[PDB]
Ligand binder design. Structure first.
Ligand SMILES: [Cl-]
Ligand SMILES: [Cl-]
Ligand SMILES: [Cl-]
Lengths: 16, 16, 16
C-alpha cells in the first residue's frame, strides 16, 4: 500500500 | 477531520 | 479530476 498525507497544523499519514 | 491535497496546476484541498 | 499523491520511497499519483 502507500501513505497519503493530510493537514490537521500537524501532518497525518493515512495508509491505503 | 483533515485536509488532503490534490494537483489540478492548482492545489485543491479536500476535507475528510 | 485531480491527482492525490502517496508515499510508497517513490511518490505515486492517484487520479480522483
Ligand atoms: Cl493508517
Ligand atoms: Cl472539502
Ligand atoms: Cl490514477
Amino acid at each position: 500500500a502507500c501513505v497519503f498525507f493530510c493537514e490537521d497544523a500537524a501532518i497525518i499519514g493515512l495508509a491505503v
